[PDB]
Ligand binder design. Structure first.
Ligand SMILES: CC[C@H](Cc1ccc(C(=O)NCc2ccc(OC)cc2C(F)(F)F)cc1)C(=O)O
Length: 257
């Protein structure tokens, strides 16, 4: 950051480009989510599902309904991330094998990342900001389902304290996709080379955007750990779901290894 030259200029262009794709690919940005959550917008005023009463107006049939709702958004979210991926310079030049691989293992990490954008301490925005379902209501569902989201909220409150904006996340999300340690990758090097350039862009983005924020870069890289864990901890919950009590086949496909 100390030096404004052709390399730093190239890193800003990669950041602008990724931001512009983020906007085209992700309708409900963090900036808009925050507006709704804090009241500012008159765009729409969401309905608050806070008990069984509220849910109907909007037994274990409700657990079915809500799990169903997640699956629908979860498939909607995987299309959003697929569209974004295509816009990351170099991504579409790798063996189809790797592309699909980088996405098989990434989507859920990006989902739990961007889910934080939709969350505060009280609950989560749903249906593109039309509804807001409370943490405590989601907690109250019949076992085992009332632990489904809690870890996603746990992650969110720590993540949202980083105070990242859509510019920040654009690059960060791209860094996650271009991970060179995904099982069964063929050409690791061209992914690492792309990620190294993305990590450069992020570092410079975070210095410009967060003047009085210490080791934010390191603190953001560490969150990739938390994310892997949410996925693993989630899979454990699903695995139970199957044995205890089906899944949309696109989610079924991604859950192979
Ligand atoms: C079943 C879905 C999981 C990952 C997953 C993906 C997305 C979300 C998510 O956006 N949750 C918020 C949400 C969205 C729509 C809903 O419609 C009623 C309901 C919810 C909510 F219930 F709050 F979680 C939550 C989890 C998977 O793919 O295994």
């Amino acid at each position: 950051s100390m030096q404004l030259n052709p390399e730093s200029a190239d890193l800003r262009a990669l950041a602008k480009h990724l931001y512009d794709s983020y906007i085209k690919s992700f309708p409900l940005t963090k900036a808009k989510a925050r507006a709704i959550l804090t009241g500012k917008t008159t765009d729409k005023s969401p309905f608050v599902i806070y008990d069984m009463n509220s849910l109907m107006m909007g037994s274990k049939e409700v657990a079915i309904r809500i799990f169903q709702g997640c699956q629908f958004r979860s498939v909607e979210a995987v299309q959003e991330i697929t569209e974004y991926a295509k816009s990351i310079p170099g991504f579409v030049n790798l063996d189809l094998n790797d592309q699909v691989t980088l996405l098989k293992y990434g989507v859920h990490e990006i989902i739990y990342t961007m889910l934080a954008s939709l969350m505060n301490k009280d609950g989560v925005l749903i249906s593109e900001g039309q509804g807001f379902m409370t943490r405590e209501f989601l907690k109250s569902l019949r076992k085992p389902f009332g632990d489904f989201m809690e870890p996603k909220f746990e992650f969110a409150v720590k993540f949202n304290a980083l105070e990242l904006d859509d510019s920040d996340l654009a690059i960060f999300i791209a860094v996650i996709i271009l991970s060179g340690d995904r099982p069964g990758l063929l050409n690791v090097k061209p992914i690492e080379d792309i990620q190294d350039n993305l990590l450069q862009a992020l570092e410079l983005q975070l210095k410009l955007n967060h003047p009085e924020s210490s080791q934010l870069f390191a603190k953001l890289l560490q969150k990739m750990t938390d994310l892997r864990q949410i996925v693993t901890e989630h899979v454990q919950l699903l695995q139970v779901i199957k044995k205890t009590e089906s899944l949309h086949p696109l989610l079924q496909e991604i859950y192979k290894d």
